[PDB]
Write a protein that binds this ligand. Structure first.
Ligand SMILES: Nc1nc2c(ncn2[C@@H]2O[C@H](COP(=O)(O)OP(=O)(O)OP(=O)(O)O)[C@@H](O)[C@H]2O)c(=O)[nH]1
Ligand SMILES: Nc1nc2c(ncn2[C@@H]2O[C@H](COP(=O)(O)OP(=O)(O)O)[C@@H](O)[C@H]2O)c(=O)[nH]1
Ligand SMILES: Nc1nc2c(ncn2[C@@H]2O[C@H](COP(=O)(O)OP(=O)(O)O)[C@@H](O)[C@H]2O)c(=O)[nH]1
Ligand SMILES: [Mg+2]
Lengths: 54, 376, 427, 48, 44, 426, 426
């Protein structure tokens, strides 16, 4: 289904569109984590580095 | 003071009634004002927008003020008339399939020589579709064989707006015989990318009324002719308003046409509610930047979007992502200079091109952008 | 053997939010509620493949509570135990004890009744609150009162968070503290003090976190509580249940105030640094540099001490170490209690929390003592109460709620009585 | 510095810290919880 | 180059200073010497 | 859950309110078209404090405009986030008081206040649990001070159990618009000390000093000063709209800050304020924020705090920060400058931390100090008042409308016994 | 850790400091844009003494520029390594003193010194443990001497427990810029002998003679003179910034070189200094450096040390050396020229070795000698002071501003008793 019924909003169950959106966000985050782990090695091959948060 | 006025209309986002907003724009102070035509009351006072190019505003154009995009339907004043009689000259400058293989250089030449592209669309025409076109040339057997040639490849159709636009285009094309054009003027586009008199790379409307009719045929109110979207093994790329404004669209599309086959493309000036949906998945990541700011830049202007496909036809996501390089233009410029984001992406949020990022995601974004937004 | 745990206030439910994280991590329960008999003292097994804790979070402001209702542990407590009011008590004892209490305590005790009825072998209660705030002090005291008239005979373990002397984040917490003790004296059975500045110095010195948040504090407090209940949850060589603290640690009907401490509080590289054994952790449990309340036990004399050992501890060396402690003369006991110790040994070591700051040590010690430095602490609070009360500052908020000066005067003289009791017992 | 810690830092480089302290700290991966078993803490005593 | 009548004589935001995270010019360079970051990871 | 209704009065209040609702809408991520387009789910959860969804995610502000000239109504439909408001809530006269306190409190009030009380009654009963009311007005104007003041009086007569925040700008002699500023301010103060719970004193002099020195701006127009006060107000009510490691509601802040029922006039500041040329050269730490907070040049009143003592103070921080660092900084500040705080109250500094910073900033602060230096500002006003009252200047337009001289003497009495008791606790 | 803040006064002070921060940044390997680009790790651990990390490798110096005329500040931002200072540290007047000590100490000071004190305070508590302050200024100019002198007095009153270095140039009749040189120098020295902990005396005459003889330059501009002074200042502070086989901090050198509280005027040298034509024809050994170090024509004062005795002396070496060679060289110098040393103090030479040489060199040294030949300089100045003051020339531009005559007599008496006690200990 695309959306939720009237009982879903009370039961707290998220709608189909909401759940698919969240899952998509998180899969994307995984991909960019892999990409960052690759870029760090590619930079240290040259002697430069990414900046890391504090 | 000087005032350019237009009635624009704006349908809103959740109570369907359309209506006119009449608009006053002051060139000297870069100032825009709005008063509703109905109710005789002010809407937006003497505030400094200065985000709209005065050249960009013209009859039938869509401009976004304060998160509302309202196309200017038509001016009210006769003063504004003469002043924009000047600019609002429109022509239909479509291309032929023989030059379609090298259309990036052509669009580059166009917008770098000086023009405006208003609306752009790539399609593939059926026989009845090409016969619906060229309606005035139905009796000529030359055209009756032309239509079969035209129905073969993938055609491009762009609307050109410029002062004296019809005349400049009839100039830059060159005579229909490309051999004599090669002999006469090498700078002519037909002489540059023309094979035979029978085949001309670029076709230009010879009359204002004819252009007004063929423009309507190509992208009329409810018309989306010759849609050619191949969902399998295709990726979505977004040429952003930065490139649309500066004219690097020709610089990017020839570059990507060199490496991949380009299939379907259009000029979509999204609404905010469409941009939020399209983007909404990159708010988790921090490399992309503020989700609100990123969405805002995308709605701030027109943008082109093409379906990219690879030569082998296996999958285009990964190869195109290596071509696009890193998400940040600095990272690209340092360790992937050949990337186009590194080449002409300004900074974090003003990056040049946006791209699909997942193989499960490419076809989804593509079919959305080429069926869902276009139908609505 | 089953014990239920209620959490009152902004501080209490965050501490509990670390405790239950620790419990599920110790018993192998995934936060969504299922495992991939020792747990039975905390989690009731409803139906199949589900375990719900025996606790009630309750508070008047909904912001922290629905932060839980949206956090990671949504599936652990479903939304009917997490009681939430509409508006806060706002650091106002009278507002929490009379205005909103009268509307929330009935629902609270009505819920705790059918929690106890689901239970069968109820050991006791243990509450979590900070006495500086408004909700944790006022309606906490009102709740403890109605629970004491409900059952009475059952032990009530009050783990309170007192205001530190110099580092403090409120203004009227002396008023709320004094008004809290006036009921915490004659209601709870065993009241454990846990200040904040001592924990700050602990994570600054031993754990060497220089920018500690509240998560790290609540994490190691949860480690102390878990080390307290490990004797009930897991089998060891010498088990000690909740009823023992009632007898072994409280020599008088009113002297129930316990300083806690813990060792070895060690990071991930100092563990490889140090050779860990029983003699030094028994030492480290007694120096003021590892106590949870900023006070100097050198100034006081111990009444009775309890030692919870976890992990790879045999009983001969704990006996040898406490023999060395009793023969040392840097610390002093009272002449009343020659048997000043109570050991307890459990087999399971303390676990680690991924992303935590503590390493997996083989053994650990939780010390819980009783001394007269606490009598010094209460005098420190009484002095800073009397100064502000001398000018009648902030009084009009309490009287505007509906209280008077009479309870202020009688709580003042009550702590004066407590001060006299500690100083006469010290002799 | 430890290689695994450096890797964790470059992992956290991508997270925006746009969530609250509570979630950001108390978040758990499903592999973070180990099944219950008799560890070598103090269990070699009773297994004689 | 002034028309004596039409010319106007006489001599002719804070969000940018408030929220600089949006500002594209003021940013981290995002690429640093490896030795520097390896010192910083253990220092900070 | 907890509810704040917003009331705007006078020209200065209306424009401040416009920028305030601009900033709030930006922090919650709703566009001026009234739809939601934010990012984090932490934004959706506490928008009932300021908004009501009407039909499908359309959020209207819970605000009531109140004025007497249509020029103000044009100026509030002026900017973006101006069409977001509620057309019915534009309760509005037509004549115009025009810098006359008697016209704002006796003549035009008699025909406008019944209407505004009805619409604010509808806004109060539209929600479930009120937390308090929040009005923004001035103390020099006529349609702002007198009208809003009676509004405060009638509301406190109606709902005596809710909180009340009043953002009031006060006249200063260096930046002085009208000539009857003391004639209106003293009467406004006279009624505010007996009606309102607490008042956040502001002024334009300190704002221009800030925009010149620390912002290093060229042309600080009014949109900027209103932007600064807006950021202040958003910083105050951030703890309700966002979760924090140490929560502090409005009433909690009031009971921590107000030791006596008449000692409730606060000086406010904000941090960080950096020039765009020196922003890159600055670090972002808690001590960096604190050293700018306790700077006397960063306060938003014309009252040098080192000319008196602090009674209490509060610091609301925004952003993921170290709590130990927060408290040690407050303690160090309290210990170094030990004479500038009051003696008979220990730990004069209450603090709170929120996890959500403002948009674009990494870590921000908001200072609220209840000092005794406000008696200088009331003295510099009362002296202007008595100098004019010794010669009865400008008096006839006031007495000829219904007011009498005894009201002016009562204002003198209350202002004077007020400043004597601040001097008493100094 | 151990902290040194920098204070630059006057035109000469600003240009000297510009070269100083150029060479320090060069030593720590940071580019003129403010980021790190070095190669060795040794530079990273001790940049906290002279910098503060701002954001992403942005290290701003802990410096405070201070003067009264914008020409000097513009010349600072014009050259390279001018884009790294914090613009808030450009505390700065508008009128200009102009060779008037009374202007620099009584009138313009009253409105500039509170502001510089604000920023130097904020920059002092920005760090944890102060080692001391480091001031570069002149004794001939007005805005340098007078303003810097009062700043020294205010600072020594607030932080009396911290060390203090003053690099002060003195005027000489042979290189004479202005006319009121003695009226400035006498008063400044009179204040420095009770306020400053120690002073490193410089002068342009000896520097010009050095670039003529040893350097054999053609056009000795101010750039090279400031270049030499910078190399001296980096040489004296290298011990804190780098490890070594024997570390000697600032207070360590002070207690080693100052036998009496008023005997704290040092003369300085520097080695190696060689002409470019002979740059490759020379050798690099510790005896080679010691010969050039103990030469009388290598001192940076116009005081022939062979006309007096060294009370004490110190030499700070940089580079991989054998301390045995270092100490025996000091012993040889002390044994051969035994008449030029004091008798009642044995082993008058303190030494130190650091293992990091300056950029481009293999081995360098820095000599600091507290001799008694400096009384020749002060007699040379005081006699000019008496020659002018005995007939009251130029006196009224000082008396007309707040100063009186007994101040000049006080400076005379203090100068006279100082040189007499130097002559006594000779
Ligand atoms: N150890 C610890 N103490 C906390 C924590 N949060 C708040 N506190 C303490 O709680 C005391 C004030 O009471 P709070 O828990 O904050 O608030 P409250 O008890 O719910 O009372 P109200 O604020 O009126 O709702 C402060 O002195 C804090 O030191 C925490 O997470 N851990
Ligand atoms: N900060 C700020 N102050 C304003 C603005 N407009 C007016 N004021 C102040 O309002 C004072 C006069 O009060 P006024 O606005 O006329 O009140 P009213 O006449 O009752 O509406 C003047 O001293 C101004 O400083 C504004 O846009 N921003
Ligand atoms: N070494 C050096 N000395 C200088 C420089 N500029 C000025 N001086 C000396 O300083 C003296 C004048 O000091 P001045 O700069 O006018 O001091 P101020 O007016 O107080 O700032 C002159 O005798 C010069 O010899 C410089 O760039 N380098
Ligand atoms: Mg609370």
């Amino acid at each position: 289904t695309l959306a939720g019924t009237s009982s879903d909003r009370d039961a707290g169950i998220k709608s189909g569109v909401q759940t698919v959106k969240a899952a998509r966000q998180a899969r994307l985050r995984e991909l960019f984590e892999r990409e960052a782990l690759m870029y760090e090695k590619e930079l240290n091959a040259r002697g430069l580095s990414l900046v890391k948060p504090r | 003071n000087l005032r350019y006025c237009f009635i624009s209309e704006w349908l809103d986002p959740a109570s369907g009634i359309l209506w006119k907003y009449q608009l006053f724009y002051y060139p000297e102070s870069k100032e825009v004002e709005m008063v509703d035509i109905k109710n005789r009351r002010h809407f937006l006072k003497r505030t400094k927008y200065e985000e709209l190019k005065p050249s960009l505003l013209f009859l039938g154009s869509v401009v976004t003020v304060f998160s509302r995009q309202l196309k200017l339907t038509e001016y009210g004043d006769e003063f504004t008339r003469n002043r924009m009689e000047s600019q609002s000259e429109r022509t239909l400058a479509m291309i032929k399939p023989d030059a379609y293989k090298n259309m990036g250089k052509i669009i580059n030449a166009i917008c770098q020589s000086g023009f405006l592209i208003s609306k752009l669309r790539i399609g593939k025409l059926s026989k009845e579709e090409a016969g619906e076109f060229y309606a005035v040339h139905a009796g000529k057997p030359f055209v009756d064989r032309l239509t079969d040639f035209m129905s073969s490849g993938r055609v491009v159709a762009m609307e050109l707006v410029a002062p004296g636009a019809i005349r400049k285009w009839r100039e830059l094309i060159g005579p229909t015989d490309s051999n004599q054009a090669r002999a006469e003027a090498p700078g002519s586009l037909r002489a540059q990318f023309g094979t035979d008199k029978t085949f001309n790379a670029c076709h230009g409307s010879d009359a204002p009324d004819t252009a007004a009719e063929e423009c309507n045929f190509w992208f009329g109110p409810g018309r989306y002719p010759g849609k050619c979207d191949l969902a399998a093994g295709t990726t979505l790329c977004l040429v952003k308003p930065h490139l649309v404004a500066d004219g690097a669209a020709g610089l990017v599309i020839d570059l990507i046409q060199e490496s991949f086959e380009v299939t379907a493309g259009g000029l979509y000036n999204l609404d905010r509610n469409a941009a939020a949906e399209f983007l909404e998945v990159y708010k988790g990541v921090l490399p992309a930047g503020d989700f609100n700011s990123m969405v805002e830049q995308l709605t701030s202007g027109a943008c082109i979007a093409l379906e990219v496909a690879d030569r082998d036809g296996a999958d285009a996501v990964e190869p195109f992502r290596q071509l696009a390089g890193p998400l940040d233009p600095e990272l690209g410029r340092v360790l992937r200079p050949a990337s186009l984001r590194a080449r002409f992406g300004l900074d974090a949020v003003r990056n040049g091109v946006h791209c699909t990022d997942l193989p499960e995601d490419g076809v989804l974004e593509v079919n959305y952008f080429f069926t869902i937004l276009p139908t609505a | 053997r089953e014990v239920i745990s209620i959490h009152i206030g902004q501080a209490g439910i965050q501490v509990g939010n670390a405790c239950w994280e620790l419990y599920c991590l110790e018993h192998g329960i995934q936060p969504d509620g299922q495992m991939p008999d020792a747990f039975n003292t905390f989690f009731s097994e409803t139906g199949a493949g589900k375990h719900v804790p025996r606790c009630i979070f309750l508070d008047l402001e909904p912001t922290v509570v629905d932060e839980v209702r949206t956090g990671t542990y949504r599936q652990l407590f479903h939304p009917e135990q997490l009681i939430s009011g509409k508006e806060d008590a706002a650091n106002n004892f009278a507002r929490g004890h009379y205005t909103i209490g009268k509307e929330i305590v009935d629902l609270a005790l009505d819920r705790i009744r059918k929690l106890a009825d689901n239970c069968t072998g109820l050991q006791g209660f243990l509450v979590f609150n900070a006495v500086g705030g408004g909700t944790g002090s006022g309606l906490g005291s009102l709740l403890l009162e109605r629970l004491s008239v409900d059952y009475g005979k059952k032990s009530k373990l009050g783990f309170t968070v007192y205001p530190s002397p110099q580092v403090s984040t409120a203004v009227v917490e002396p008023y709320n503290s004094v008004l809290s003790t006036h009921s915490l004296l004659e209601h709870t059975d065993v009241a454990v003090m846990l200040d904040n500045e001592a924990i700050y110095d602990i994570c600054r010195r031993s754990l060497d976190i220089e920018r500690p948040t509240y998560t790290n504090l609540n994490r190691l407090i949860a480690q102390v509580i878990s080390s307290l209940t490990a004797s009930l949850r897991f089998d060891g060589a010498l088990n000690v249940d909740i009823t023992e603290f009632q007898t072994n640690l409280v020599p008088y009907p009113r002297i129930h105030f316990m300083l806690s401490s813990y060792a070895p509080i060690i990071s991930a590289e100092k563990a490889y640094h140090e050779q860990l054994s029983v003699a030094e952790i028994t030492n480290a449990a007694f120096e003021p540099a590892s106590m949870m309340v900023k006070c100097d036990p050198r100034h006081g004399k111990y009444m009775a001490c309890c030692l919870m050992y976890r992990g790879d501890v045999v009983p001969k060396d704990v006996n040898a170490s406490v023999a060395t402690i009793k023969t040392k003369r840097t610390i002093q006991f009272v002449d009343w209690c020659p048997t000043g110790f109570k050991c307890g040994i459990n087999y399971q070591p303390p676990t680690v929390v991924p992303g935590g700051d503590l390493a997996k040590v083989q053994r650990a010690v939780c010390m819980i003592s009783n001394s007269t430095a606490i009598g010094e602490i209460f005098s420190r609070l009484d002095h800073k109460f009397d100064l502000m009360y001398a000018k009648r500052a902030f009084v009009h908020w309490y009287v505007g709620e509906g209280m008077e000066e009479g309870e202020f005067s009688e709580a003042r003289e009550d702590l004066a009585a407590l001060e006299k009791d500690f100083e006469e017992v010290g002799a | 510095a430890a290689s695994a810690e450096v890797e964790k830092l470059t992992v956290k480089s991508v997270d925006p810290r746009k969530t609250s302290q509570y979630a950001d700290d108390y978040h758990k991966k499903p592999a973070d919880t180990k099944a219950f078993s008799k560890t070598g803490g103090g269990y070699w005593i009773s297994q004689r | 180059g002034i028309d004596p009548a039409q010319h106007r004589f006489g001599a002719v935001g804070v969000r940018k200073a408030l929220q600089p995270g949006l500002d594209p010019s003021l940013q981290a360079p995002k690429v640093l010497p490896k030795l520097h970051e390896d010192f910083k990871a253990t220092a900070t | 859950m907890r509810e704040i209704v917003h009331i705007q009065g006078g020209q200065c209040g209306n424009q401040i309110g416009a920028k305030f609702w601009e900033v709030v809408s930006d922090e919650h991520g709703i566009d001026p078209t009234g739809t939601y387009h934010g990012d984090s789910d932490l934004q959706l959860e506490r928008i009932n404090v300021y908004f009501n969804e009407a039909t499908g995610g359309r959020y209207v502000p819970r605000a009531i405009l109140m004025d007497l000239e249509p020029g103000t109504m044009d100026s509030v439909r002026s900017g973006p986030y101006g069409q977001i408001f509620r057309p019915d809530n534009f309760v509005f006269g037509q004549t115009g008081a025009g810098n006359n306190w008697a016209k704002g409190h006796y003549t035009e009030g008699a025909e406008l206040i019944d209407s505004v009380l009805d619409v604010v009654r509808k806004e109060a009963e539209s929600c479930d649990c009120l937390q308090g009311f929040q009005v923004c007005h001035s103390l020099g104007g006529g349609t702002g001070s007198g009208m809003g003041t009676l509004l405060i009086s009638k509301i406190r007569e109606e709902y005596p159990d809710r909180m009340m925040l009043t953002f009031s700008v006060v006249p200063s002699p260096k930046v002085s618009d009208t000539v009857v500023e003391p004639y209106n301010a003293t009467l406004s103060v006279h009624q505010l000390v007996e009606n309102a719970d607490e008042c956040m004193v502001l002024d334009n002099e300190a704002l221009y000093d800030i925009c010149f020195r620390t912002l290093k701006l060229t042309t600080p127009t009014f949109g900027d000063l209103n932007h600064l006060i807006s950021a202040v107000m958003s910083g105050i009510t951030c703890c309700l709209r966002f979760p924090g490691q140490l929560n502090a509601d409005l009433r909690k802040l009031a009971v921590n800050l107000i030791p006596f029922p008449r000692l409730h006039f606060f000086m406010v500041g904000f941090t960080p304020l950096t020039s765009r040329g020196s922003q890159q050269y600055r670090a972002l730490t808690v001590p960096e924020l604190t050293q700018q907070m306790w700077d006397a040049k960063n306060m938003m009143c014309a009252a040098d705090p080192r000319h008196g003592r602090y009674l209490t103070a509060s610091a609301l921080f925004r952003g993921r920060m170290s709590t130990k660092e927060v408290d040690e900084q407050m303690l160090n500040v309290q210990n170094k400058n030990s004479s500038y705080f009051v003696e008979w109250i220990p730990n004069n500094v209450k603090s709170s931390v929120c996890d959500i910073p403002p948009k674009g900033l990494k870590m921000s602060a908001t200072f609220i100090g209840n000092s005794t230096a406000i008696q200088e500002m009331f003295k510099r006003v009362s002296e202007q008042f008595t100098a004019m009252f010794r010669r009865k200047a400008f008096l006839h337009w006031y007495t000829g409308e219904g007011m009498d001289e005894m009201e002016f003497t009562e204002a003198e009495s209350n202002m004077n016994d007020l400043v004597s008791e601040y001097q008493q606790y100094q």
